[PDB]
Coordinates of C-alpha atoms in Angstrom, one line a residue:
Chain A
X1 CA -6.7 -11.3 -22.4
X2 CA -8.5 -13.8 -20.1
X3 CA -12.0 -13.1 -18.7
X4 CA -12.2 -12.8 -15.2
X5 CA -15.4 -11.8 -13.3
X6 CA -14.0 -8.4 -11.8
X7 CA -15.2 -6.3 -9.0
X8 CA -14.6 -2.6 -8.6
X9 CA -11.7 -1.5 -6.3
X10 CA -13.3 -1.4 -2.8
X11 CA -11.0 1.3 -1.3
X12 CA -13.3 4.3 -1.6
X13 CA -16.2 2.2 -0.1
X14 CA -14.0 0.6 2.8
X15 CA -13.3 4.2 4.1
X16 CA -17.0 4.5 4.8
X17 CA -17.8 1.3 6.7
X18 CA -18.8 1.7 10.3
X19 CA -20.6 -0.5 12.9
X20 CA -24.0 0.4 14.3
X21 CA -25.5 -1.0 17.6
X22 CA -28.7 -0.6 19.2
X23 CA -29.5 -2.7 22.2
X24 CA -27.8 -6.0 21.3
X25 CA -28.3 -5.7 17.7
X26 CA -25.1 -5.0 15.6
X27 CA -24.8 -4.5 11.9
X28 CA -23.0 -2.4 9.2
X29 CA -23.6 1.2 8.3
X30 CA -22.5 3.8 5.6
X31 CA -20.8 6.9 6.8
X32 CA -20.9 9.5 4.2
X33 CA -20.0 13.1 5.2
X34 CA -21.9 13.6 8.5
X35 CA -24.5 10.7 8.0
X36 CA -24.7 7.1 8.6
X37 CA -27.1 4.8 6.7
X38 CA -28.0 1.4 8.0
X39 CA -31.0 -1.1 7.9
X40 CA -33.7 0.3 10.3
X41 CA -34.1 -3.1 11.5
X42 CA -30.9 -2.5 13.7
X43 CA -33.4 -1.4 16.2
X44 CA -35.4 -4.7 16.4
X45 CA -34.8 -7.1 19.2
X46 CA -35.1 -10.8 18.0
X47 CA -38.8 -10.9 19.1
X48 CA -39.8 -7.7 17.4
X49 CA -38.6 -9.3 14.0
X50 CA -41.7 -11.3 13.7
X51 CA -44.0 -8.3 13.1
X52 CA -42.6 -5.1 14.1
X53 CA -44.1 -1.6 13.8
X54 CA -40.9 0.5 13.0
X55 CA -42.8 3.7 13.5
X56 CA -43.7 2.7 16.9
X57 CA -40.3 1.1 17.7
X58 CA -38.5 4.1 16.6
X59 CA -40.5 6.5 18.8
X60 CA -38.9 4.8 21.7
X61 CA -35.2 5.5 20.8
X62 CA -33.1 8.6 21.2
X63 CA -29.9 9.7 19.7
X64 CA -27.8 8.2 22.6
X65 CA -29.9 5.0 21.9
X66 CA -27.5 4.5 19.0
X67 CA -23.9 3.5 19.1
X68 CA -21.9 4.0 16.0
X69 CA -18.2 3.1 15.8
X70 CA -15.5 4.0 13.3
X71 CA -12.9 1.3 14.0
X72 CA -12.4 1.7 17.7
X73 CA -13.4 5.4 18.1
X74 CA -17.1 6.1 18.6
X75 CA -19.1 8.7 16.7
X76 CA -21.8 10.6 18.5
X77 CA -25.3 10.5 17.0
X78 CA -26.9 13.9 17.1
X79 CA -30.0 13.2 15.2
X80 CA -32.0 10.3 13.7
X81 CA -34.6 9.9 10.9
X82 CA -36.1 7.0 9.2
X83 CA -36.6 6.9 5.4
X84 CA -38.5 3.8 4.2
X85 CA -36.6 0.7 5.3
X86 CA -33.3 2.8 5.9
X87 CA -32.3 4.9 8.9
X88 CA -30.5 8.1 8.6
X89 CA -28.3 8.9 11.9
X90 CA -26.7 12.3 11.8
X91 CA -23.3 12.5 13.6
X92 CA -20.9 15.1 15.0
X93 CA -17.8 14.0 13.0
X94 CA -17.5 14.1 9.3
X95 CA -15.9 11.4 7.3
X96 CA -12.9 13.1 5.5
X97 CA -12.6 9.8 3.5
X98 CA -16.2 10.4 2.0
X99 CA -15.6 9.9 -1.8
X100 CA -17.8 11.6 -4.7
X101 CA -20.8 9.6 -4.9
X102 CA -24.5 9.3 -6.0
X103 CA -27.4 7.0 -4.8
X104 CA -28.7 4.9 -7.7
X105 CA -31.6 2.6 -8.1
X106 CA -30.4 -0.1 -10.6
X107 CA -32.6 -2.1 -13.0
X108 CA -32.8 -5.9 -12.9
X109 CA -30.1 -7.5 -15.0
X110 CA -27.5 -5.0 -14.0
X111 CA -24.1 -5.8 -12.2
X112 CA -22.4 -4.2 -9.3
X113 CA -19.7 -4.6 -6.7
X114 CA -20.6 -5.8 -3.1
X115 CA -18.3 -5.1 -0.2
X116 CA -18.9 -8.0 2.4
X117 CA -18.5 -6.6 6.0
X118 CA -18.9 -7.9 9.6
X119 CA -19.0 -5.3 12.5
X120 CA -18.1 -2.4 10.2
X121 CA -15.0 -4.3 9.0
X122 CA -14.3 -5.2 5.5
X123 CA -14.0 -8.8 4.6
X124 CA -14.1 -9.2 1.1
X125 CA -15.3 -8.0 -2.4
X126 CA -17.2 -9.7 -5.2
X127 CA -19.0 -8.8 -8.5
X128 CA -22.6 -9.8 -9.0
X129 CA -25.8 -9.3 -10.9
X130 CA -29.3 -8.0 -9.8
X131 CA -31.2 -11.1 -10.6
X132 CA -34.5 -10.6 -12.5
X133 CA -36.5 -11.7 -9.7
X134 CA -34.9 -8.9 -7.9
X135 CA -32.7 -11.1 -5.5
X136 CA -28.9 -11.3 -5.7
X137 CA -27.3 -14.8 -5.5
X138 CA -24.8 -13.7 -2.8
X139 CA -24.2 -16.8 -0.7
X140 CA -21.9 -14.5 1.2
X141 CA -23.8 -12.2 3.5
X142 CA -24.0 -14.4 6.8
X143 CA -24.4 -11.5 9.3
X144 CA -23.2 -8.6 6.9
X145 CA -26.5 -6.5 6.8
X146 CA -25.6 -2.8 6.1
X147 CA -23.1 -4.2 3.4
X148 CA -23.3 -2.2 0.2
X149 CA -23.4 -2.7 -3.5
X150 CA -21.8 0.0 -5.8
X151 CA -20.3 0.9 -9.1
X152 CA -17.4 3.1 -9.8
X153 CA -17.4 5.4 -12.8
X154 CA -14.0 7.0 -13.0
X155 CA -13.7 8.8 -9.6
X156 CA -17.5 8.8 -8.5
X157 CA -19.1 5.9 -6.6
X158 CA -22.8 5.0 -7.3
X159 CA -24.2 3.2 -4.3
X160 CA -27.1 1.0 -5.5
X161 CA -27.6 -1.7 -2.7
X162 CA -27.8 -2.3 0.9
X163 CA -28.1 -5.7 2.2
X164 CA -31.0 -6.4 4.6
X165 CA -32.2 -10.1 4.4
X166 CA -31.4 -13.8 3.9
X167 CA -34.7 -14.9 2.1
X168 CA -34.8 -18.6 3.1
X169 CA -34.6 -20.1 -0.5
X170 CA -30.8 -19.1 -0.3
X171 CA -30.3 -15.8 -2.2
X172 CA -30.6 -12.2 -0.6
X173 CA -32.8 -9.2 -0.8
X174 CA -32.0 -5.7 -0.3
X175 CA -32.7 -1.9 -0.5
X176 CA -31.5 1.0 -2.6
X177 CA -29.7 3.8 -0.8
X178 CA -32.8 5.5 -0.4
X179 CA -34.4 2.6 1.5
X180 CA -37.0 1.2 -0.9
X181 CA -36.6 -2.6 -1.4
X182 CA -35.7 -4.4 -4.5
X183 CA -38.5 -6.9 -5.3
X184 CA -41.7 -7.7 -3.3
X185 CA -39.9 -8.0 0.1
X186 CA -40.3 -6.4 3.6
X187 CA -38.3 -6.0 6.7
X188 CA -39.8 -9.0 8.5
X189 CA -39.0 -12.5 9.9
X190 CA -41.8 -13.9 7.8
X191 CA -41.7 -16.6 5.1
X192 CA -41.1 -14.9 1.8
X193 CA -40.3 -16.4 -1.5
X194 CA -38.1 -15.3 -4.3
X195 CA -40.3 -14.8 -7.4
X196 CA -39.6 -16.8 -10.7
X197 CA -36.3 -16.0 -12.0
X198 CA -34.9 -16.0 -15.6
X199 CA -31.6 -16.0 -17.3
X200 CA -30.4 -12.7 -18.3
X201 CA -30.5 -13.0 -22.2
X202 CA -28.8 -9.5 -22.8
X203 CA -25.8 -10.5 -20.8
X204 CA -25.5 -14.0 -22.4
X205 CA -25.1 -12.5 -25.7
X206 CA -22.6 -10.0 -24.3
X207 CA -20.8 -12.8 -23.0
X208 CA -20.7 -14.7 -26.4
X209 CA -19.5 -11.4 -28.0
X210 CA -16.7 -11.5 -25.5
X211 CA -15.6 -15.0 -26.4
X212 CA -15.5 -13.6 -30.0
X213 CA -13.4 -10.6 -29.3
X214 CA -11.0 -12.9 -27.4
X215 CA -10.7 -15.1 -30.3
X216 CA -13.3 -17.9 -29.9
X217 CA -15.6 -18.8 -32.8
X218 CA -16.8 -22.4 -32.7
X219 CA -20.2 -21.7 -31.6
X220 CA -21.3 -19.4 -34.5
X221 CA -23.4 -20.6 -37.5
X222 CA -24.6 -19.9 -41.1
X223 CA -28.1 -18.9 -39.7
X224 CA -29.8 -15.8 -38.8
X225 CA -33.2 -15.1 -37.0
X226 CA -35.8 -12.5 -36.4
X227 CA -36.4 -11.2 -32.9
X228 CA -39.7 -13.0 -32.7
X229 CA -38.5 -16.4 -33.8
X230 CA -35.5 -16.1 -31.4
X231 CA -37.9 -15.5 -28.5
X232 CA -40.3 -18.3 -29.3
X233 CA -37.2 -20.6 -28.6
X234 CA -35.2 -18.7 -25.7
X235 CA -38.6 -18.5 -23.8
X236 CA -38.8 -22.2 -23.6
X237 CA -35.4 -22.4 -21.9
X238 CA -36.5 -19.8 -19.4
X239 CA -34.6 -16.8 -20.9
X240 CA -35.8 -13.3 -20.4
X241 CA -37.6 -12.2 -23.5
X242 CA -35.4 -10.2 -25.8
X243 CA -36.6 -6.6 -27.0
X244 CA -35.4 -4.3 -29.6
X245 CA -33.8 -2.1 -26.8
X246 CA -31.6 -5.0 -25.8
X247 CA -30.6 -5.4 -29.6
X248 CA -29.8 -1.6 -29.8
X249 CA -27.6 -2.0 -26.7
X250 CA -25.5 -4.7 -28.2
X251 CA -24.9 -2.2 -30.9
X252 CA -21.2 -1.4 -30.3
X253 CA -20.2 -5.0 -29.6
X254 CA -21.7 -6.1 -32.9
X255 CA -19.9 -3.4 -34.7
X256 CA -16.7 -4.3 -33.1
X257 CA -17.0 -8.1 -33.8
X258 CA -18.6 -7.6 -37.2
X259 CA -21.3 -10.1 -36.1
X260 CA -25.0 -9.0 -36.3
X261 CA -27.0 -9.1 -33.1
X262 CA -29.6 -11.2 -34.8
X263 CA -27.0 -13.6 -36.2
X264 CA -25.3 -14.0 -32.7
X265 CA -29.0 -14.8 -31.6
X266 CA -29.2 -17.5 -34.1
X267 CA -25.8 -18.9 -32.4
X268 CA -27.4 -18.8 -28.9
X269 CA -30.6 -20.4 -30.3
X270 CA -28.4 -23.4 -31.5
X271 CA -26.5 -23.5 -28.3
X272 CA -29.8 -23.6 -26.1
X273 CA -31.1 -26.5 -28.7
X274 CA -28.0 -28.5 -28.8
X275 CA -26.1 -27.8 -25.6
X276 CA -22.3 -27.2 -25.7
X277 CA -21.2 -30.9 -26.3
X278 CA -18.5 -30.9 -23.7
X279 CA -17.0 -27.8 -25.3
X280 CA -16.2 -24.8 -23.3
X281 CA -16.7 -21.1 -24.0
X282 CA -14.4 -18.4 -22.3
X283 CA -13.7 -21.2 -19.9
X284 CA -17.1 -21.9 -18.9
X285 CA -19.1 -25.1 -19.4
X286 CA -22.5 -23.2 -18.9
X287 CA -23.8 -20.0 -20.5
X288 CA -22.8 -16.9 -18.4
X289 CA -25.1 -14.1 -17.8
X290 CA -23.6 -11.9 -15.0
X291 CA -21.6 -9.7 -17.4
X292 CA -23.5 -6.7 -18.9
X293 CA -22.7 -5.5 -22.4
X294 CA -21.2 -2.5 -20.5
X295 CA -18.9 -4.9 -18.4
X296 CA -17.8 -6.6 -21.6
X297 CA -16.9 -3.3 -23.5
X298 CA -15.1 -2.1 -20.3
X299 CA -12.7 -5.3 -19.6
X300 CA -12.1 -6.3 -23.3
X301 CA -10.9 -2.7 -24.1
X302 CA -10.0 -0.8 -21.1
Chain B
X1 CA -38.7 -17.9 7.6
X2 CA -36.8 -14.9 6.3
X3 CA -33.7 -14.0 8.3
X4 CA -32.0 -10.6 8.9
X5 CA -28.8 -9.0 10.2
Chain C
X1 CA -20.1 -19.8 -2.7
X2 CA -18.4 -17.0 -4.9
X3 CA -14.7 -16.4 -5.2
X4 CA -14.0 -13.5 -3.2
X5 CA -11.3 -11.0 -3.5
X6 CA -9.6 -9.4 -0.4
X7 CA -10.6 -5.7 0.2
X8 CA -8.2 -3.7 -2.2
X9 CA -7.9 -0.4 -0.3
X10 CA -4.4 -0.8 1.2
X11 CA -3.0 -1.7 -2.1
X12 CA -4.7 0.9 -4.1
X13 CA -2.9 3.5 -2.1
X14 CA 0.4 2.0 -3.2
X15 CA -0.3 2.1 -7.1
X16 CA 1.6 4.5 -9.3
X17 CA 2.1 5.3 -12.9
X18 CA 5.8 4.8 -14.2
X19 CA 6.8 6.3 -17.5
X20 CA 10.4 5.9 -19.2
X21 CA 10.3 7.3 -22.7
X22 CA 7.4 6.2 -24.8
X23 CA 6.7 3.3 -22.3
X24 CA 4.1 3.5 -19.4
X25 CA 3.1 1.0 -16.8
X26 CA 2.0 0.5 -13.3
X27 CA 4.3 0.8 -10.3
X28 CA 4.2 -0.1 -6.5
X29 CA 5.2 2.5 -4.0
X30 CA 6.3 1.3 -0.5
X31 CA 8.0 3.8 1.7
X32 CA 10.7 5.6 -0.5
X33 CA 10.9 3.0 -3.1
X34 CA 8.8 2.2 -6.2
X35 CA 9.0 -1.2 -7.8
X36 CA 8.0 -1.9 -11.5
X37 CA 8.9 -4.4 -14.2
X38 CA 12.3 -3.7 -15.6
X39 CA 11.2 -4.0 -19.2
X40 CA 9.8 -0.3 -18.7
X41 CA 13.0 1.0 -20.0
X42 CA 12.2 -0.6 -23.5
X43 CA 10.5 -0.1 -26.7
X44 CA 9.6 -3.3 -28.5
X45 CA 12.7 -3.9 -30.7
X46 CA 14.8 -4.2 -27.7
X47 CA 12.4 -6.9 -26.1
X48 CA 13.6 -9.4 -28.8
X49 CA 16.7 -10.0 -26.5
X50 CA 17.5 -6.6 -24.7
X51 CA 20.6 -6.5 -22.6
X52 CA 18.8 -4.7 -19.8
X53 CA 22.1 -4.3 -17.7
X54 CA 23.6 -2.3 -20.7
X55 CA 20.3 -0.5 -21.7
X56 CA 20.0 0.7 -18.0
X57 CA 23.5 2.2 -17.8
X58 CA 22.4 4.8 -20.4
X59 CA 19.3 5.7 -18.1
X60 CA 19.3 8.5 -15.4
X61 CA 16.8 9.4 -12.6
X62 CA 15.2 12.0 -14.8
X63 CA 14.7 9.3 -17.4
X64 CA 12.0 8.2 -15.2
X65 CA 8.5 10.0 -14.6
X66 CA 6.9 8.5 -11.5
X67 CA 3.4 9.7 -11.0
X68 CA 0.9 9.3 -8.1
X69 CA -2.4 11.0 -9.0
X70 CA -1.5 14.1 -10.4
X71 CA 1.5 14.9 -8.0
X72 CA 5.0 14.0 -9.6
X73 CA 7.4 11.8 -7.5
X74 CA 10.9 13.0 -7.8
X75 CA 13.2 10.0 -8.4
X76 CA 16.5 10.0 -6.7
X77 CA 18.1 6.6 -7.4
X78 CA 17.6 3.6 -9.5
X79 CA 18.9 -0.2 -9.5
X80 CA 17.8 -3.4 -10.8
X81 CA 17.0 -6.6 -8.9
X82 CA 16.6 -9.6 -11.3
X83 CA 13.6 -8.8 -13.5
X84 CA 12.6 -5.6 -11.3
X85 CA 13.4 -2.0 -11.1
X86 CA 13.9 -0.4 -7.8
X87 CA 13.4 3.4 -8.0
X88 CA 14.2 5.4 -4.8
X89 CA 12.0 8.5 -4.4
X90 CA 12.5 11.8 -2.4
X91 CA 9.1 11.0 -0.7
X92 CA 8.0 8.2 1.6
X93 CA 4.4 7.0 0.8
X94 CA 2.1 8.2 3.5
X95 CA -0.3 5.3 2.7
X96 CA 2.4 2.6 3.0
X97 CA 0.5 -0.3 4.7
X98 CA 2.2 -3.1 7.0
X99 CA 3.7 -5.5 4.3
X100 CA 5.8 -8.5 3.4
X101 CA 7.1 -9.9 0.2
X102 CA 6.5 -13.7 -0.2
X103 CA 6.9 -16.2 -3.0
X104 CA 3.6 -18.1 -3.4
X105 CA 3.5 -21.7 -4.1
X106 CA 1.9 -23.6 -7.1
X107 CA -1.8 -23.9 -6.5
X108 CA -2.1 -21.2 -3.9
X109 CA -4.3 -18.2 -4.5
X110 CA -4.3 -14.4 -4.2
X111 CA -6.1 -11.2 -5.1
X112 CA -5.0 -9.1 -8.1
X113 CA -5.6 -5.5 -8.4
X114 CA -5.6 -4.9 -12.4
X115 CA -4.2 -1.4 -13.0
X116 CA -4.0 0.8 -16.1
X117 CA -1.2 3.7 -16.0
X118 CA -1.4 4.2 -12.3
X119 CA -5.3 3.8 -12.0
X120 CA -6.7 0.6 -10.2
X121 CA -9.5 -0.7 -12.6
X122 CA -10.9 -3.7 -10.9
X123 CA -10.0 -6.6 -8.5
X124 CA -10.5 -10.3 -8.7
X125 CA -9.3 -13.6 -7.3
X126 CA -7.1 -16.2 -9.1
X127 CA -4.6 -19.0 -8.3
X128 CA -1.1 -19.7 -9.3
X129 CA -1.5 -22.4 -11.8
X130 CA 0.5 -25.8 -11.6
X131 CA 2.2 -24.8 -14.9
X132 CA 3.2 -21.5 -13.2
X133 CA 0.9 -19.2 -15.1
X134 CA -2.3 -17.3 -14.1
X135 CA -5.6 -17.1 -15.9
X136 CA -6.4 -13.6 -15.2
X137 CA -7.5 -10.5 -17.3
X138 CA -4.8 -8.0 -18.3
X139 CA -5.3 -5.4 -21.2
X140 CA -2.6 -3.0 -22.3
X141 CA -0.7 -1.2 -19.7
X142 CA -1.5 -3.4 -16.7
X143 CA 2.1 -4.4 -16.2
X144 CA 3.2 -3.8 -12.7
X145 CA -0.2 -5.0 -11.4
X146 CA 0.2 -7.0 -8.3
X147 CA -1.2 -9.9 -6.3
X148 CA -1.5 -10.2 -2.8
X149 CA -3.2 -11.9 0.2
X150 CA -4.3 -10.2 3.5
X151 CA -3.8 -11.2 7.1
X152 CA -5.3 -8.9 9.7
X153 CA -3.2 -5.7 9.0
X154 CA -0.3 -7.1 6.9
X155 CA -0.5 -7.2 3.2
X156 CA 1.5 -10.0 1.6
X157 CA 2.7 -9.1 -2.0
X158 CA 3.4 -12.3 -4.0
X159 CA 3.0 -11.3 -7.5
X160 CA 3.8 -8.6 -10.2
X161 CA 2.8 -8.8 -13.7
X162 CA 5.2 -8.8 -16.7
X163 CA 4.3 -10.9 -19.7
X164 CA 1.4 -12.5 -21.5
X165 CA 1.8 -15.8 -23.1
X166 CA 0.4 -16.9 -26.5
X167 CA -2.0 -19.2 -24.6
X168 CA -3.7 -16.1 -23.6
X169 CA -2.3 -16.8 -20.0
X170 CA -0.1 -14.6 -17.8
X171 CA 3.6 -14.6 -16.5
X172 CA 4.9 -12.7 -13.6
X173 CA 7.5 -12.4 -10.8
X174 CA 7.5 -12.0 -7.1
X175 CA 8.4 -8.7 -5.4
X176 CA 12.1 -9.7 -5.8
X177 CA 11.9 -9.9 -9.5
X178 CA 12.2 -13.6 -9.9
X179 CA 9.7 -15.2 -12.4
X180 CA 7.4 -17.9 -11.5
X181 CA 8.1 -20.9 -14.0
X182 CA 10.8 -20.9 -16.7
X183 CA 9.5 -17.8 -18.4
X184 CA 11.8 -14.7 -19.3
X185 CA 11.0 -11.2 -19.8
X186 CA 12.2 -11.1 -23.5
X187 CA 10.5 -11.8 -26.8
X188 CA 10.8 -15.5 -27.5
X189 CA 9.2 -18.9 -28.3
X190 CA 8.4 -19.9 -24.7
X191 CA 4.9 -21.3 -24.2
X192 CA 3.0 -22.6 -21.2
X193 CA 3.6 -26.3 -20.1
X194 CA 0.5 -28.3 -19.9
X195 CA -1.7 -27.6 -16.9
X196 CA -3.4 -30.1 -14.3
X197 CA -6.3 -29.8 -11.9
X198 CA -5.3 -28.7 -8.4
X199 CA -6.3 -31.8 -6.5
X200 CA -5.7 -30.1 -3.1
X201 CA -8.2 -27.2 -3.8
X202 CA -10.8 -29.4 -5.3
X203 CA -10.7 -31.4 -1.9
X204 CA -10.8 -28.1 0.0
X205 CA -13.9 -27.3 -2.0
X206 CA -15.7 -30.5 -1.2
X207 CA -15.1 -30.0 2.5
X208 CA -16.8 -26.6 2.1
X209 CA -19.6 -28.4 0.4
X210 CA -19.9 -30.6 3.3
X211 CA -19.6 -27.8 5.7
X212 CA -22.4 -26.0 4.1
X213 CA -24.7 -29.1 4.0
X214 CA -24.1 -30.3 0.5
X215 CA -22.8 -34.0 1.3
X216 CA -24.6 -36.3 -1.3
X217 CA -21.2 -37.2 -2.9
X218 CA -20.0 -38.8 0.3
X219 CA -19.7 -42.6 0.6
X220 CA -19.1 -45.5 2.9
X221 CA -15.6 -46.3 1.6
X222 CA -12.0 -45.0 1.6
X223 CA -8.9 -45.3 -0.4
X224 CA -5.1 -45.8 -0.4
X225 CA -3.2 -42.5 -1.5
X226 CA -1.5 -44.6 -4.2
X227 CA -5.0 -45.8 -5.5
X228 CA -6.4 -42.3 -5.6
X229 CA -3.4 -40.9 -7.6
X230 CA -3.8 -43.9 -10.0
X231 CA -7.4 -42.6 -10.7
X232 CA -6.8 -38.9 -10.4
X233 CA -3.8 -38.8 -12.8
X234 CA -6.1 -40.3 -15.4
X235 CA -8.5 -37.5 -15.1
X236 CA -5.3 -35.2 -15.3
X237 CA -5.4 -34.3 -11.6
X238 CA -2.3 -33.1 -9.7
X239 CA -0.9 -36.1 -7.8
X240 CA -1.7 -35.8 -4.0
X241 CA 1.0 -35.9 -1.7
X242 CA 1.4 -36.7 2.0
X243 CA 2.3 -33.0 2.6
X244 CA -0.9 -32.2 1.2
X245 CA -3.0 -34.4 3.1
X246 CA -1.7 -32.6 6.2
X247 CA -2.7 -29.3 4.9
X248 CA -6.3 -30.7 4.8
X249 CA -5.9 -31.6 8.7
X250 CA -8.0 -28.7 10.0
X251 CA -11.0 -29.0 7.4
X252 CA -10.8 -32.8 8.1
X253 CA -11.0 -32.2 11.8
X254 CA -13.7 -29.8 11.5
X255 CA -16.0 -32.3 9.5
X256 CA -14.8 -35.5 11.0
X257 CA -14.1 -36.8 7.5
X258 CA -10.4 -38.1 6.8
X259 CA -8.7 -36.9 3.8
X260 CA -8.7 -40.3 2.3
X261 CA -12.3 -40.8 2.8
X262 CA -13.0 -37.6 0.9
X263 CA -10.7 -38.9 -1.8
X264 CA -12.7 -42.0 -2.0
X265 CA -15.7 -39.6 -2.7
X266 CA -13.7 -37.6 -5.2
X267 CA -12.6 -40.8 -7.0
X268 CA -16.2 -41.8 -7.4
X269 CA -17.3 -38.2 -8.4
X270 CA -14.5 -38.6 -11.2
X271 CA -15.6 -41.9 -12.5
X272 CA -19.2 -41.4 -12.5
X273 CA -19.6 -37.6 -12.9
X274 CA -22.3 -35.8 -11.0
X275 CA -25.4 -37.3 -13.0
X276 CA -26.9 -33.7 -13.3
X277 CA -26.7 -32.9 -9.6
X278 CA -24.6 -30.0 -8.4
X279 CA -22.3 -28.9 -5.4
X280 CA -22.4 -25.7 -3.9
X281 CA -24.2 -24.7 -7.3
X282 CA -21.3 -25.4 -9.8
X283 CA -21.9 -28.3 -12.1
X284 CA -18.1 -28.8 -12.1
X285 CA -15.5 -29.5 -9.5
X286 CA -13.9 -26.2 -8.5
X287 CA -10.2 -26.1 -8.0
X288 CA -9.4 -22.5 -7.3
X289 CA -10.2 -22.3 -3.4
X290 CA -7.4 -23.3 -1.1
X291 CA -7.9 -25.0 2.2
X292 CA -7.3 -21.5 3.7
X293 CA -9.8 -19.6 1.5
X294 CA -12.3 -22.3 2.7
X295 CA -11.6 -21.5 6.5
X296 CA -11.6 -17.8 5.5
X297 CA -15.0 -17.4 3.8
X298 CA -16.8 -20.0 6.1
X299 CA -15.4 -19.1 9.5
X300 CA -16.2 -15.5 8.5
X301 CA -12.8 -13.6 9.2
Chain D
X1 CA 4.2 -13.1 -26.0
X2 CA 3.3 -9.5 -25.1
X3 CA 5.6 -7.4 -22.9
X4 CA 4.3 -4.0 -22.1
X5 CA 0.8 -5.3 -21.0
Chain E
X1 CA -33.2 23.0 30.8
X2 CA -31.6 20.6 28.4
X3 CA -33.3 17.5 26.8
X4 CA -30.7 14.7 26.3
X5 CA -31.6 13.7 22.9

C-alpha cells in the first residue's frame, strides 16, 4: 500500500558515471562499453559560452585535450566525435559494468529517473516527469551537467536524458542520448524562456485511479461526460487537452477499478471546479501529475 | 541568462 | 526541492531471494550471512500467534532456499535474533559494502529499496514517523526490503520491512530484529497510534527555503520555546525540545537566524496560513527533510 | 495487518 | 612519424 513517488534503482547507471575535463571545464559523462558521452559544452571556456561555434572550437582539440576519469583512475581518449549537442569520446578501456541498454527519445508527459552527479560521482536519485513545455522541474542539478535520465525495463536500461542547462526561470533543459535537445533550447548562455506549460491530464487521471485502487473514493460522483465537454472545462484550468488516445491508454486501469474513463473525467471536472475542500487524495492536497498510467499499473500491482 | 555545467 | 534518495547500488548488490516452503521474501546478504524477517518460516495460520522458537526447531538448513540472481547460495547454519533470522552461507558476498547497523530515531529519514523476491524494483525516501511507522509503498513479497543512509563509503542499515498495518502504513525492525514501536510480528489487533507533524524537520525545511532565497515568511519578532509549543501543539505539531534546537545550530549559523526567531515565523505561518503563497514550491509545510538532508542537498555532497 | 508483504 | 592525437 502507500503511494510513494519512486525512482528506478540507480546501480546499473552508477557503474557508468565518470568525470570529463577539458581545460578548466569539468562535468559528468556516460561510459558505456568503450565510449563516453557528455555535453559538448565541456569544451567551452566561460567566455565562449556567450556565442560559441562548436564546429570551430572542436577543431582545436585533440584526443589528449580531454581528461576522463573513472574514480581516481584515468581513461585514455583515443578518438573524439561530435553528434549534435553531445560528444562521443572513444577510450582504450572498456567498462565491464556496462549494462544492457538502449537510447530513447521520450515524449512530453512521460516519467524517468535522474541520477544527480558531481564530478562523475553519484549524489542522489529522483523520479520526475518530462514537462509538457519540454523542461524538467529538477531544482536539483546545480553543477551536474552530464547527469542522465533513464528507465529500467527488467534488466535493460533505456537512457532518455542528459542534463545540459539551468534555464533562468528555474527548471532545466536537456538532450536525448543522441544529442538532440528537448524543447526549443540551445547550448548557449543566452536568455531563453521555457514555453507555456500545462498540467499533464493523462497522469492526473492515472493518479485518481491509484487512489481508487488504494481504497479512496470520496471524489467520485453520479455524473459522466463526453470527451469534448470535459476538455471545454479542463482547458480553462490549464490542463493538457485530452484525446481518444489518452482515454484508450487508461484502458486497463479503468477495467481494474470498474470505473469508466469518461466517468473518472467527470470526477476530475468536479475537482477542478470545486477544489478539494481541505480534503486530501493519496495524501496530497493538490492534484498529482508526475505518475504515468504505466507507473500506477507498475506500483499498485507489481 | 541560461546557465550551463 | 525534491526528496532525493541515496544512490542504491551498494545495497542492490546485497539483495537476495529467500524461500522457505511456500513462502518467499527478500534477504540482505552481507559477508557470509543473510538476514531476513523470521516470519519467513510461516504460512499464514501460524501468524495468528506462531511460536517461532518451536517452529524453527523443525527447520533445517536445507529448509531454506537462498538465491542471488540465478545462482543458489548454500546455507550452512541458521539462528534467530529477536525478529530476524540469521542464515550463514558457504559464500561471502563479493559485493559486500562497508557497513554499520544503527537504530534510527523518530523523525529521522532514510532511503528504502523496495524489493520483490530478490529483485530491487525502485527506490524512494521516507521518514520514521513519530508514531513509529513509515508511509512507504510495499506490495506483495517486499518483506525484507531495507532502509539505509549513506556517508561517504559506509552504508548504514537502519530498517527492514516486516508488517503492514490496517492503516495502510508499515512496521519494521532494525538490523538486530527489534521492532520500531510496540508492533509485533504476529497477526493481531494492533494499530498505529496517532501521528504528529515533525516540527524539527519543518524547521529545517524553512531554513532551506531561506537558504535558496525564499524568505517572505520571516518576521521581526521571536518567541519563547514554551510559547511555541503551546501554539504548535494546537496544530498537532511535535513539541520542540532544547535538544532539537541544538540540532538546528548549523543551519541557524549558516543563515544567522536563531531557532526561536524561525519558530516565531512558523507560529505565524501556522495561525495565518500561507495566503496562497508558496515555499520552495509546496503549498504545504514539508516535514520529511531532516536538518542533515538540508545540509546534504544544499551543500552538494 | 499483513505479514508476508 | 607519429602524430600525437
